[PDB]
Design an enzyme around this catalytic site. Structure first.
Site, PDB file in Angstrom:
ATOM      1  N   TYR A  21      40.673  26.543   6.370  1.00 42.51           N
ATOM      2  CA  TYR A  21      40.462  26.219   7.824  1.00 42.51           C
ATOM      3  C   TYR A  21      39.498  27.391   8.525  1.00 42.51           C
ATOM      4  O   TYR A  21      39.097  27.068   9.633  1.00 42.51           O
ATOM      5  CB  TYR A  21      41.731  26.195   8.468  1.00 42.51           C
ATOM      6  N   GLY A 137      47.225  40.469  29.304  1.00 44.74           N
ATOM      7  CA  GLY A 137      46.541  39.217  28.622  1.00 44.74           C
ATOM      8  C   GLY A 137      47.283  38.333  28.594  1.00 44.74           C
ATOM      9  O   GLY A 137      46.873  37.066  27.969  1.00 44.74           O
ATOM     10  N   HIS A 142      52.601  33.718  24.307  1.00 43.31           N
ATOM     11  CA  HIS A 142      52.175  33.213  22.890  1.00 43.31           C
ATOM     12  C   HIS A 142      53.323  33.113  21.886  1.00 43.31           C
ATOM     13  O   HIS A 142      53.097  31.817  21.171  1.00 43.31           O
ATOM     14  CB  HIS A 142      50.973  34.137  22.090  1.00 43.31           C
ATOM     15  N   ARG A 175      51.071  34.732  32.841  1.00 47.87           N
ATOM     16  CA  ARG A 175      50.229  33.898  33.777  1.00 47.87           C
ATOM     17  C   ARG A 175      51.663  33.465  34.850  1.00 47.87           C
ATOM     18  O   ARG A 175      52.718  33.351  34.554  1.00 47.87           O
ATOM     19  CB  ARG A 175      49.585  32.803  33.234  1.00 47.87           C
ATOM     20  N   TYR A 194      39.050  38.909  32.093  1.00 46.18           N
ATOM     21  CA  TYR A 194      37.699  38.689  31.533  1.00 46.18           C
ATOM     22  C   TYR A 194      36.926  37.600  32.273  1.00 46.18           C
ATOM     23  O   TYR A 194      37.258  36.754  33.114  1.00 46.18           O
ATOM     24  CB  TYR A 194      38.129  37.883  30.112  1.00 46.18           C
TER      25      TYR A 194
END
Ligand SMILES: CN1c2c(nc(N)[nH]c2=O)NC[C@@H]1CNc1ccc(C(=O)N[C@@H](CCC(=O)O)C(=O)O)cc1
Ligand SMILES: CN1c2c(nc(N)[nH]c2=O)NC[C@@H]1CNc1ccc(C(=O)N[C@@H](CCC(=O)O)C(=O)O)cc1
EC number: 2.1.1.20
Lengths: 281, 287, 277, 285
Positions: A21, A137, A142, A175, A194
């Site tokens: 992949y 970040g 995640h 977030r 960013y």
């Protein structure tokens, strides 16, 4: 019967051929996403350097290293950086950057390793602990919760915390999901880190299991092809009681909102919630 | 709507979580295997170093770098080495070694880059050429024939030969598939490039499409230290026949070269008694 | 990195069970469509009531399924035409009809295979049926991968253009207005059967409800299904335009008339329509 | 976690929507193929009916029913027929035919049920036995050797033989895999059971595990009327010697066994290489 025969096992590589992949239309677009966003906001650098210095912090541990962008900064500012991540594909970029700049004494003392929060204690030879640990970040989101009891999350923080020396700092952010869940829509490019110099159509997909937010997926599109990522929608309320118990209460909490401190019932709705903590006991 | 839905796309990573399948059981055992091959025999080093001196080869391009074992050796023996591979998963180990030994000047001048044979002309900056080009460890066989006409094979060999400067050397090998195809089994673990300290059982599966060999699949069952424990992984290879390959590697130079084949480091005379495990083609580029 | 299959997807072969035919999920699912093939007297009463008091006799079931709803109308002398897109569901209706082929009624029971998306060509009607039924929340089974409900408009446009003028159409769907809101879909609501642990999973895309999934359990095995969460508000404007306005639309709620701002919150919303023009 | 979210579990259906993969391109072309095999040759009917009369066989069990082509024939010729298959997708066509002709008394007495060879003893009520048991069309080869020791093969044959009453007949065949393995290709489309009106190109893939044939995969490329699409099927390549040994062992070696080579007796070493091998076994008792 109905089984499927694979030429090679999943996870296996071979000299001469691209890994599995490695270059699909999705990974290709994703490459640009982690490249066309490897720039930083002066506001961010100011705040981060500010907080770190005014604490006597020098030996910093980045547990969400990634492409090294946040660490490459602390390295240029003479900090003693130890960048770590579980993703060898993300790390490839940090290392590649360090090697290109191996002539600069600073980048020669930059430790980049591979570690997994779930086993950070054994993966990272700390001992003395670090002055500061950063997980910025929105990287912690995640980590999903396939277990079903956030237990996976408790272990991750328990480990991330037991990596900070007493009287040490911990800057872990996420977030603003309290707002995203509500509005169902998560603003694209509405970052604070960013500088988005890329085209991005974001399609938010929230999944509620038995009325309880369980996941948020983002489909990034650009031209024709798209890729996707998933996060665990953390509630500022639930994250707090969670990050503190990881220390065992012995912590001096504080929460910012896009670098500015945060007060409940406030007027401005934050994009990111940053949790700073001093490991008192 | 019968279609599975992904947490994240295929081939995408995220800080904090292991990549796609890195922690699986096959990947784990596969890692014990590539860390075992990391140890070459005295006979092999002597032959390769012998071969590279006998021609004065200084600048060497390793086009099937892998974990960098052969490259690490040529670096220690004074050569100018530039290693290259398409597999980041394996290149990771080479880079890691070059970093630990970055203080040794020979290792600081050791170039390691990602490049794919099929696009080698653009992936690697040469234009001039390399004294010698090596592709050993039976790596070329990893490249399958998807289209069915071996066009990828000719394109990869062509790009690989291109890297050899006039009067240059190209050392490329493949296992003896003439024997594996005939008996359906892969020789009794006896390897000549490396000493296999790890225990293994190998199941060989050959697939023939219209009576023409198309693929050989090996299932390695490793006795993992712990658990006497038994887990396994699989890999496939295109079964290149000596005649076919001799024809293909020469054609890659345009027939403009000297070509000789070894049978386990020793010259190979057709019809000889000793059946070789590997066939090494050494080609000197005319100009 | 390709994967290789011994046989294509969708293909079968003499002597071996079809693909996935007997996994732990299909097995539990078998029990689900069996341990719920019973009916509520309240239901039978309401359905027979409505159908008879309209002069309806030639009925078309477009969500045939295991035939349970049709097997009823067949025992009541109706002229039944049971249709469905799922051959695996149909297997059960047919099997029932053959067991009872001796009963003149079950011998005149037409069971065929048709797809709403192509009902017009799949079903030889011409004239039009007196009544068409699509009950059991079957229409919600049709997702909207297109993204513009277009798939849904075609389904109803076709289902409607199957009713003879002055004809009836009884199409229902669970109460999603409520499920979306409460996030929890009422588990085990005796209104159609009398059979499990249900785990509701709603997926909202850009703040717009997009799908509802139910994970059914039994003890160490489960199965799941997905539906499109239809809003009683949006379904109405949708089902009517399928007729072109020419219809006396009416909405119930558990076999009884529904009035907005009502007190009792329905489990199912049944939409009945007479094809005026 | 890198798991995938299904809209519905594998093997589950829902009223209103087509089943799992029924409308795919391979399934569509595969359907043109099983509807083409629906037509047997005059030589085949003559042989089978010949064979079944020559023994007085009245009650016949078709254990590889399929779309019911051979069964539909024996039904018309007056036999007592009970058809059976593990594949609902194919059985659907048999049932459909028996329903259309439900008015013909012979067809109303035609039993069709789902049953799996591996569990045949329980899936079908016999206890007594059948005059003859048929499994033709090279169907037994569909059963793969998952475990690697052909245990499933022995179990399926055993259950199949069980259905044959003493003095009974068992007719079971397989394609000539001795030839396919040797040349790596499947004979030039010439079939003897049915007339192939449809055009096809066949790519043969043989897989050998440790030098032992383990599988033959055929990729059929059909020239679909209109618009070239294809589908694939796999088979265990049974060798005459191995199969003769296996089918006898299923009866306990207690039976008479003879093999045909395309309806004609097969003498080892004969010149004519058969496409199919039919084993006919009379059960001692
Ligand atoms: C499925 N198989 C299988 C098994 N054993 C088990 N337990 N389960 C299985 O699924 N035995 C091996 C058999 C192998 N089947 C196959 C089928 C097709 C191709 C195939 O097409 N192979 C070519 C590529 C063709 C192409 O790319 O178009 C190849 O190189 O593998 C290979 C093996
Ligand atoms: C993966 N998931 C998961 C799990 N639990 C376990 N054990 N393993 C898992 O993998 N919990 C549920 C979570 C669900 N994740 C997802 C991610 C995306 C979509 C999704 O895109 N769903 C839409 C279709 C979107 C489209 O078609 O573009 C849907 O209808 O399901 C759904 C669920």
């Amino acid at each position: 019967v109905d089984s499927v025969y694979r030429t090679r096992s999943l996870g296996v590589a071979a000299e001469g051929i691209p890994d599995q992949y490695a270059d699909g239309e999705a990974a290709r677009v994703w490459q640009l996403y982690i490249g066309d966003t490897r720039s930083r906001t002066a506001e961010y650098k100011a705040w981060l350097l500010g907080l770190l210095r005014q604490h006597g912090c020098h030996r910093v541990l980045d547990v969400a290293c990634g492409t090294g962008v946040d660490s490459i900064m602390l390295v240029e500012e003479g900090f003693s950086v130890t960048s770590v991540d579980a993703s060898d594909k993300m790390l490839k970029y940090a290392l590649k950057e360090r090697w290109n700049r191996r002539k600069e004494p600073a980048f020669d003392k930059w430790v980049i390793e591979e570690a997994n929060w779930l086993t950070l204690d054994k993966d990272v030879p700390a001992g003395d602990g670090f002055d500061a640990v950063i997980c910025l970040g929105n990287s912690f989101a995640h980590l999903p919760d396939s277990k079903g009891d956030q237990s996976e999350h408790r272990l991750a923080l328990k480990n991330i915390a037991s990596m900070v020396r007493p009287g040490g700092l911990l800057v872990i952010d996420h977030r603003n999901y309290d707002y995203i869940l509500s509005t169902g829509c998560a603003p694209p490019g509405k970052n604070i880190y960013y500088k988005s110099d890329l085209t991005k159509d974001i399609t938010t997909s929230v999944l509620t299991v038995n009325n309880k937010a369980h996941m948020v997926t983002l489909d990034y599109t650009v031209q024709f092809s798209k890729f996707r990522l998933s996060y665990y929608p953390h509630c500022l309320a639930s994250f707090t009681e969670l990050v503190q118990e990881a220390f065992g209460g012995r912590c001096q909490h504080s929460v910012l909102g896009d670098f500015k401190p945060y007060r409940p019932g406030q007027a401005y709705v934050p994009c990111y919630f940053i949790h700073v903590l001093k490991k008192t006991g």
